[PDB]
Structure 1
């Protein structure tokens, strides 16, 4: 079980660790988060009490190094850093644990929520979408734009999601205009799965990462990407049976986890109605259709 120590908490802030969150008061003796489950990516995220604008945070995997948080009074944010000295870090964590100045990652044993939201998400894929190769962890915030959003302005701070565009030469074979537009199977299976992603696991990993950035940071471009990757599958007449069954599980846990009060901003009416009621896969998402109908019948 891994630990992310905090040097201090000089400014009042709501701290998120995956789907959990804690309020910390200005100069509260908070020194970090212990008992973090090994084997998953994690996200540690922040919303300042004095400027709720800019949610921001760090994707990391404790198997890849020893990470800590330290407030930077110049840049005015909580920064993730790597401690390269193993013994210095173990000694910091042991002290803070002994003085019980750390919150415990509050995982209920029955609860597979985080596994289910991050099943396909791999740190190495995150680091290609979020490019800052000198760090092993990845910064994301509310305002970062996607490569696609920038096409339609600082490339170093972009989310490099795979560009999906239904009215693009990439999506439409010359001479198969109507066929490829109404049935996106060649775009899904040849261009995206075989071509770019190599396999369904990488495609699902990007879909899951886009959702989490949409939910945790209200990142609008991430929300667009999550919906585009759903729509590309639901609009394909030919999808492997294992992908449809897995998609139904993925979306079920995403809809289950979404704060009830954010359905209005994070869910696209057109995409969901099309995916559940009109699309080729209208009858292939039983779990998702049932949770959506019971939790968000207004949207539909």
Structure 2
């Protein structure tokens, strides 16, 4: 179990750590988060009390270095940083842990929620989507745009998701216009999976990362991406049985974890009804359809 210590908490802020969150008051004696499960990526995120504009946050993996949070009063935010002095990082952390100034990552032993949401998410792939190579952690916020959003404005601050476009020459073979537009299996299997993603694990990993960004930061571009990657599978007549089964699981836990009160904005009515009720895979997502129908029957 690892630790993300904080130099201080100078401004009131709600702090998220994965699917958990807690309030820290202005100048409260808070010095970080302990007992973070090794083995998974994590995200630590922030919404200032005085200005809920800009949720922002950091994807990281404690195996890849020692990371601490320190407020910057010039840029006005909690910044993640890397300490390369291993010994010195251990002394300060041990002090705060002896003084019980850290909250404990609150994992229930029965609970596989986080694993289920990040099963295919890997820090190395995050860093290709979020370009900032001098850091081992990846900053994201509400307002960052995607490469496709910039095609339809700063390239360094963008989310480099894989562009999916159903009415594109990539998606459509000359001479199979009708076939490829009404059945997207070519685009899914040859272009995206074999061509770009190499395997279904990288594809699912981008999909989960897109969903997490959308739900934790309210990033619209991420939401677009998540819906696009779902629709591309659901709109393909030929999908490996193991992807469909895994997809059903992935979506089920995403829907389970979504705040009920954010459903209105985070869930695309057209995409979901199409996916569950009209598409080639309309009968292949049993778990997802059941939770969707019992939890959000309004949307449908």
The structural deviation recorded for 1:162 is 0.1
The structural deviation recorded for 1:193 is 0.2
Superposed CA offset, 1:55-81 (max 9, x none):
000000000000000000000000000
Q: Distance in 2 between matches of 1:8 and 1:122?
A: 29
Q: Distance in 2 between matches of 1:86 and 1:99?
A: 20
SS at match of 1:270: helix
Which residue does the alignment assign to 2:252? Answer: 252
The structural deviation recorded for 1:264 is 0.4
Q: Distance in 2 between matches of 1:91 and 1:179?
A: 64
Which residue does the alignment assign to 1:232? Answer: 232
Superposed CA offset, 1:205-224 (max 9, x none):
00000000000000000000
Which TM-score applies when normalising by structure 1? Answer: 1.00
The structural deviation recorded for 1:12 is 0.1
Q: How many residues align?
A: 300
SS at match of 1:230: helix
The structural deviation recorded for 1:22 is 0.6
Which TM-score applies when normalising by structure 2? Answer: 1.00
SS at match of 1:121: coil
The structural deviation recorded for 1:184 is 0.2
The structural deviation recorded for 1:279 is 0.2
Q: Distance in 1 between matches of 2:299 and 2:150?
A: 29
SS at match of 1:107: coil
Show structure 2 runs of 5+ residues with no match. none
Superposed CA offset, 1:127-169 (max 9, x none):
0000000000000000000000000000000000000000000
Q: Distance in 1 between matches of 2:89 and 2:257?
A: 34
What is the RMSD computed on CA atoms of the aligned residues? Answer: 0.2
SS at match of 2:170: helix
The structural deviation recorded for 1:242 is 0.2
Moved segments of 4+, more than 2 Å: none
Show structure 1 runs of 5+ residues with no match. none
The structural deviation recorded for 1:38 is 0.3
Which residue does the alignment assign to 1:94? Answer: 94
